[model samples]
Target: SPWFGMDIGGTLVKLSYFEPIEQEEVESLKSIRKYLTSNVAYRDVHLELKDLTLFNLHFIRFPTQDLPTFIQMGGGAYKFEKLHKLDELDCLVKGLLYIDSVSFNGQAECYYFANCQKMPFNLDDPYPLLVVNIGSGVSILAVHSKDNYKRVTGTSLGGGTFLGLCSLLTGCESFEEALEMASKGDSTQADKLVRDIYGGDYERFGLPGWAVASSFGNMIYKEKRESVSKEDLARATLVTITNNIGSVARMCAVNEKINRVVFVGNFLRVNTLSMKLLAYALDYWSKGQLKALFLEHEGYFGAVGALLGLPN
Candidate 1:
């Protein structure tokens, strides 16, 4: 049985656990169950899927900084380690496809925002697609088949960048806090839009009046800089990062001739604003040519992929 898969990334460690419906008792199983059930620091009840395919699949996460302790407890020692070291990207793709194949308790796993509304997307024929994973940084994969995919490109401006910039600009202590600030703030106050540049839509280029022409460009003026709030700064930081990632993802999809793009990673966890913005960016920039897809098990796919490899 594939009981557990752990994916340790730059910023966070994701753990995917598969609890079988029918259990066979053993000393190791007993001890593992006891520890997992009683643990307060890591058993994330918020992300669990009960009775998924005759098994309860639980998703948990902790910071990478605590990984050493996590390893010492059960991962790295000679007695504790009987692990298969899988490639991170390999696990990512495997986990993603697996999750997409199996719906989340008969509900759609993939979705996109259309006009700021959540819309289910069918991945029944997912191939020749782009996987844009935004973690601490970013990784763009051109997936042609189940195992035929390449890391086409990546970027440094991702979740870590957003959090760090938010910390500096807004004194936000957590990712959630940063997002909260962004939700109340307006990006146009900090960014220079096409309307600000051309007095309206850039008709020649078809750039909408509301489209961002230069992020944080308006802040160059001392008057605007003085008027900008922490919330505006936070929103602009988010917009800048999401737009860059979307732009890069769009380019990768075009170069690879892939129409479907799935965006994943911890960056999108509880981050609806970024998701909507990404969906808009990909569609607007591509002139409705590209669609941005997202997954429910966004941050846990890598761990799930790792778990899937346990049977091997």
Candidate 2:
């Protein structure tokens, strides 16, 4: 049975838990808190499992904040700069434990991939793995086994990079606005591709002519450039950052012989351009050996882990 798990960040609070198969009887306490309710905030998800009316599997965003949620949520865990993790860890462990147990037929599950439903994984052993957490900033963790992991590497350019830089480039008032614009624009309009410089496919280097030669490289010759839409620029920016993050994450994973990599964060949520770009880069750089894995509960993994923390 899933219990209540809460992973609170600088900007958002993710909640995970389960209730009876009914939707009318379940009630929540934390979600209705004075601090949460009657407050100005972004859109949030709701789950009424069996009347639980509990804020289950939801991502709550911070309308105002500058720090990376994941980065700020670790270290000493319980009191890490007000971002608690101990409880989340405890719950996650318990939740996962239940899923992997015999009575629950947890062992029947072969892959624990997130959001990415198409790919398959074969991890029945103590294989080296990497966990990429993309929030305001990026964090890549090396997982040695079920019980231990380390923040082996990280990058300053992440979701925050996207939000901050996209706003500046696109003059969009909000992250969603810029992202929406990006979806409308083409990366080739702003990104300098291999063919743009080579005048032909850069196949010898194993890079497709379509591969980014330099992000926004096309913007260099502004005098000769036509009026480009802000959305095109936004698309280029998105490509650059996503590719870079994927490349960096692969480097960390490859060095440690990690074959399985799981990406989690608010950044990847519904961000198709970034997700596809990340997957493509990792797959290419890894010589088709690795696939970028995502969690359906990307933003709620920690919370789900914690919610199922109870021993039962």
Top of the candidates by lDDT:
1
Predicted candidate 1 versus true structure: per-residue lDDT over 1-312, tens digit per residue: 547888775556688877666345534655664574466335256557766673388787766555555433412222234245677788889888887887777778898887767889889679978988887789899999997998989999998899899899988988889898998888889999999989998999777799888999999999999999998888899888988888888888878899999888778877678888888778866778888889888878888888876653
Model 1 scores worst on lDDT over the 10 consecutive residues at: 73-82
Candidate 1 local lDDT, residue 90: 89
The lDDT values for all models are: 0.80, 0.62
lDDT (Cα, tens digit) per residue for candidate 2, span 163-248? 79878876789887888898888878777889998987877867778778888788887852476788887877787888888789
Q: Candidate 2 regions off by >4 Å?
A: 1-3, 20-127, 224-226, 308-312
Q: Which segments of candidate 1 are over 4 A away from where they belong?
A: 22-55, 63-84
Deviation in Å, model 2, residue 84 alpha carbon: 6.6
